[PDB]
């Protein structure tokens, strides 16, 4: 249940060559989700283009700030293909 | 004074603060006079 509606960029800069910070709703007023739900594989597969060829605004390394409805934390993606997914940080 | 520095290519620009500071010059009043009798036009080979 990814919302485009809900998920902001952080940092600022436009160099591609290093990392980006995104910052992602889901309490009540977002997607309404929890942490786990977001966290899990693939979750974020509706924010790239074409998944399977890992096109999209996601790249591996950026940082997501997750704020779920119980609780939030940093996350990293570690893989864009041929699913988004996201560790802890 | 101002100061260049360097960036990355598409970064966001990161200016060198230039400071200001301000410096105060107090205004006084002086005089100088004199009085000039007129009994002494007639008695003076000069003009007072």
Do not use: C
Not at chain 1, 35 to 45: C, E, H, W
Not at chain 1, 73 to 89: E, G, K, L, R, W
Not at chain 2, 5 to 16: E, F, G, L, W
């Amino acid at each position: 249940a990814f919302g485009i509606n809900y998920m902001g960029r952080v940092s600022t800069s436009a160099n591609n060559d290093t990392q980006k910070v995104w910052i992602y709703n889901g309490t009540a007023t977002g997607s309404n989700e929890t942490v786990a739900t977001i966290a899990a594989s693939g979750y974020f597969n509706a924010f790239m283009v074409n998944v399977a060829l890992g096109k999209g605004p996601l790249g591996v390394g950026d940082l997501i700030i997750i704020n779920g409805n119980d609780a939030s934390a940093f996350y990293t993606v570690q893989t864009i293909t041929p699913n988004v997914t996201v560790s802890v940080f | 004074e101002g100061m260049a520095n360097q960036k990355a290519p598409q970064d966001d620009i990161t200016p060198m603060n230039v400071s200001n500071r301000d410096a105060e010059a107090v205004i006084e009043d002086w005089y100088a006079s004199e009085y000039a009798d007129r009994s002494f036009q007639n008695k003076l080979a000069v003009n007072a």
